[PDB]
Design a protein around this ligand. Structure first.
Ligand SMILES: Cc1cc2nc3c(=O)[nH]c(=O)nc-3n(C[C@H](O)[C@H](O)[C@H](O)COP(=O)(O)OP(=O)(O)OC[C@H]3O[C@@H](n4cnc5c(N)ncnc54)[C@H](O)[C@@H]3O)c2cc1C
Ligand SMILES: Cc1cc2nc3c(=O)[nH]c(=O)nc-3n(C[C@H](O)[C@H](O)[C@H](O)COP(=O)(O)OP(=O)(O)OC[C@H]3O[C@@H](n4cnc5c(N)ncnc54)[C@H](O)[C@@H]3O)c2cc1C
Ligand SMILES: COc1cc(OC)c2c(c1)c(C)cc(=O)n2C
Ligand SMILES: COc1cc(OC)c2c(c1)c(C)cc(=O)n2C
Ligand SMILES: [Zn+2]
Ligand SMILES: [Zn+2]
Lengths: 230, 230
């Protein structure tokens, strides 16, 4: 406060561990006096497909469809579909975007992948130039709050899954850094379903505590070295 | 000769460079006498979202929906939605699965992510235990055939994007090897929008040429070292 937060939330069940994490984030950020908005993608039936329906009116080139060029032209000419533009208005206003999701195949669920693909379009989130340190959402913070089915030990460099930082790369680097975000340290809640009824409260109460001082945090160095190195 | 190939194809435009790559694969593998099937996800309006619509029977826990528990039970009972079981039959029959797509945010387009999320369910593609070298699709081969906006140089260890292998990890390892596939070396067709008409022709031809001998190939060692070094 005075800060705005967008929580993009991708879980089907409000009673889930993910739902609890989204709800404590709203509760704690609302208590601090921050402005809070939640894009509840499943409840919204959010469209994940990148298709020519994302441009309204008439196309730059209706013989050969190029999603990147069409949506770039459409963002410049204010003719993107209203579900996209609604989400761009949220992100444009936000000082922090928190993604809350269960890890699906070492990445985001498809409905959230579709939000990244369709809302983070050229002209809005990035351009030539304006990417990585210079991306168009520069100034803004982003944070992945991810839950996993695999344990922390599975997610080490010599573990069956590799270090968590390895799967973070396309999300933190290739997507958030790329668009300009400073990335806060991910919040990774390992294997909640196998944890006890408390312990899970440890993790929820722990995210609420972290959120108390989120605006004091320095963003990680979003480097190949941070992700893979020594 | 006597092999079955599934191509899971994710591009909106038949006239695109991805479209040319898919078509050359069909032409060359058809020429060789292989059995070929293509799942053209956008033309199928393939559903990417993981929702409770994917199970048609009585849920195990209708009070608190857990997509992974409900779909595992649905797969064992034969009560998954038919679009999913349609794709599982194609995968079960295939000896090789080629994924043909443009790189979206260092990953697959969300329509293809939802193919992975919904088709590769517990019981069918993996079980716990029954993953990585014990995954249920053991015996099968997979190959990612990717196109990029970024040049090969941008995709090297000291380029901006980092090495191309780094973005392959959640797909090759976290998804395909997790399900028991052996993974053939990726086909990466760099920056075809930047390339001349000639260089594009050569990249289509280079893919066709590689497919002539694809059944002679051995898979990669799908480890942390192969992807990251050290
Ligand atoms: C398609 C698919 C792909 C996947 N791919 C991967 C992958 O690549 N890698 C991987 O590691 N995992 C993967 N998973 C597993 C997935 O990441 C986990 O199942 C998910 O992260 C668990 O979080 P949840 O909210 O769904 O858990 P929940 O099951 O909702 O949480 C566990 C328990 O906590 C309860 N709970 C709710 N709120 C609270 C609270 N206030 N305090 C205490 N308990 C609470 C729940 O109701 C439940 O009993 C995959 C799953 C699917 C379906
Ligand atoms: C949401 C989104 C996210 C993206 N994220 C990334 C990313 O993370 N990293 C990245 O590097 N890129 C990214 N891109 C760029 C994208 O990967 C490239 O635009 C795409 O890979 C290029 O493939 P295409 O088929 O669309 O090319 P096209 O534009 O179709 O192909 C280039 C040219 O080749 C022509 N062609 C077709 N067939 C032939 C043929 N037989 N012979 C000669 N020429 C032919 C086409 O007609 C066209 O003129 C992103 C794009 C979008 C829209
Ligand atoms: C596809 O669904 C799942 C479910 C899981 O556990 C529930 C998984 C995974 C995938 C992967 C890729 C790694 C892992 O460690 N675990 C535990
Ligand atoms: C998000 O859309 C795009 C479009 C591109 O090029 C057309 C990109 C990228 C993303 C990324 C992340 C890296 C890159 O090198 N290129 C060239
Ligand atoms: Zn980075
Ligand atoms: Zn592997």
């Amino acid at each position: 406060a005075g800060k705005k937060v967008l929580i993009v939330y991708a879980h089907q069940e409000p009673k889930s561990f993910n739902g609890s994490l989204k709800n404590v984030a709203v509760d704690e950020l609302s208590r601090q006096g921050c402005t809070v908005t939640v894009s509840d993608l499943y409840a919204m039936n959010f469209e994940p497909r990148a298709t020519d329906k994302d441009i309204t009116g008439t196309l730059s080139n209706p013989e050969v469809f190029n999603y990147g060029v069409e949506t770039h032209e459409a963002y410049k000419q204010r003719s993107l579909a209203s579900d996209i533009t609604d989400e761009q208005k949220k992100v444009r206003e936000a000082d922090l975007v928190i993604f809350q999701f269960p890890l699906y195949w070492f990445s985001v669920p498809a409905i959230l992948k579709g939000w990244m693909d369709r809302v983070l379009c050229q002209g809005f989130a990035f351009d030539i130039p304006g990417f990585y340190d210079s991306g168009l959402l520069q100034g803004k913070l982003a944070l992945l709050s991810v839950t996993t089915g695999g344990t922390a030990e599975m997610y080490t460099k010599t573990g069956v899954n590799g270090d968590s930082r390895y799967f973070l790369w396309p999300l933190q680097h290739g997507t958030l850094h790329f668009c300009g975000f400073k990335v806060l340290a991910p919040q990774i809640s390992f294997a909640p379903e196998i944890a006890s009824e408390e312990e899970r409260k440890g993790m929820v109460a722990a995210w609420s505590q972290r959120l108390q001082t989120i605006w004091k945090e320095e963003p990680i160095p979003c480097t190949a070295h941070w992700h893979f190195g020594q």
